[PDB]
Structures are given as C-alpha cells and as structure tokens.
Symmetry: C3
Subunit: 110 residues, 3 copies
C-alpha cells in the first residue's frame, strides 16, 4: 500500500465544507495552516514590501493511493467557487508513515 500526501491551497471559507465532505467519505486527519498569496508595493530603506495579500488555507490529508483520485475530486469539487484564486490541489509520494501513539506503519497508520 503506497501512501500519498494530498495538499490543497483553497479559499478560507471553503474549509468547513471540505472537512465535512472528507469526513463523510471516511477520510480523517486533515490539518490546515493559514497561508497567503499576493494581490501593490511600497519602499523602505532599500527593500520592496507588498502591502496587499490574499488569505488562503493550506490543507493536508494522507491517504492510500487507492483513495487518492476520490479525495482529490472531493477537494476540487468542494473548494471551487468559480472566481479566480480558487487554488490548486497536488499529490506527493510518502515513503514512510508512522502513527506516534501506537507506532503503526503504513495503512495501519492512516
């Protein structure tokens, strides 16, 4: 069983819907971090400073390769609003996974 990390950067107000849709599908362990994209600029002692940012959330969930397609579609179809900046979803390969409490590995750790 091959592990995969699904990462998505989406608009913040889609978070709860994304959570609920993944829970409904038996997918748990989602974590979320606040992040930013860029929208003008100002100068101060030799550096440029953006004064305008777009708030996003980065969500991550770990699942088996067999669920990956389903999970990606759930996130995409739930995060979409039709406006620019709806975000991206990408997959990365996980070579080893350990559940801290039990020491379980692989599928036993999902």
């Amino acid at each position: 069983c091959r592990m995969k990390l699904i990462t998505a950067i989406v608009k913040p107000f889609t978070l709860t819907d994304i959570k609920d849709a993944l829970e409904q599908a038996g997918v748990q362990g989602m974590t979320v971090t606040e992040t930013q994209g860029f929208g003008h600029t100002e100068v101060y002692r030799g550096a440029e400073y953006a004064v305008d940012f777009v708030p996003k959330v980065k969500i991550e969930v770990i699942i088996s390769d067999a669920q990956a397609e389903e999970v990606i579609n759930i996130i995409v179809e739930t995060a979409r609003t039709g406006k620019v900046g709806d975000g991206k979803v990408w997959m990365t390969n996980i070579e080893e996974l350990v559940r801290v409490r039990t020491g379980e590995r692989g599928e036993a750790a999902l």
Copy 2:
C-alpha cells in the same frame, strides 16, 4: 536527501528539538497548524467551530539518518493519549544552501 515532517502536540516541541540536537540533527523549522475535534449552522451553511492546536515540524536529513530521526521524533512526541499525531518522509530531489550555493549533502 529526505524531508521528515511531523504534526505533534505543541507541548512536545522543545523536547523534540533537544532530542534531535543530542543526535547531531539541526535545522528544524516549526509552523503552527490545526486539527479538528463540533460544527455550527448559520444561514444554511456549516462552520467548524472547534480546532485542535498542533505544530508542524520539518527537518531535512540525509537518507542515512532518516529512520533514526523519525523514531526520535516519535518517541519524544508520544504521550500515549489520542492526538499524538503522525510522522512521514518525502524525497528531496535537490537541495541548495542559499548563502553558499552548496548542493546536496554539502547543503546540510
């Protein structure tokens, strides 16, 4: 090169930092992140109203040390109570030190 990522209870953070230093492992970075533990309805929409604070720690380590870094994090983050989190490894295909331009193992 390998990236070790772990999401653990916040209060284990500097025990983990100390344990990795003792094993000669440095370069850790930490970001605050949230898990989920309840939901509220407001105008036909659902809003998560309950989050669990965690920290996301990342360390870049040679393949030779990857397994002991994983097991050091696991034993030090472990409380036995639920929510202890997870540790995982992803492959790094290129690594560069910004200041010197060194690449690969020279960049650790």
Copy 3:
C-alpha cells in the same frame, strides 16, 4: 511538475516575488514559520527564543525548476548565516480548482 520550497529571511519575500514574477513565474504562496535561536522547564523544556522565517512555495514544470531555484537562491541570499535553504520535491498530480485542468494545463 515540481514543487519548489524555500525557507528564507522574511525581508527578502517581496524581492523574491518580484524576481519570480519578472521571470513569468506565478502562484507563489508564503507561510510564516519559525527556526530556533535558551530554555526553561515547566515536566517539559520550553524554548523562549525563535527566529522568524518565511516558507515560500512555487509549483513549476521540470523545465523551469533550475531557473526558479537559482532566482530564489540569488534573490534570497544576503551573505550572512541563516540565509535558508531551497529544495525540490516531485509532484505526481496537479489540479487547478476553478477549471479542473491537470498537469501542465494547471500551471
């Protein structure tokens, strides 16, 4: 498809974004993160000192990966310790949320 990640000093952020933008590279996201700089106990130790950094991530094709890495390395460099690191990880699937485009079409 490749993910470029960099931990850099926070005052380089908009310069790096400017440089990448001039090279036609878009989609950068940035997250505040912390490195370590003394300690007291409470029964666990507690570090009272952290060094602020910014994590930047940009997704690019294999073809541009080396250009992007050098732009970030060159723009983020100050010459003083703590300048950070840049690393590349493989992306196996990429989807643009608004359209459903995949792969190269999702950049």
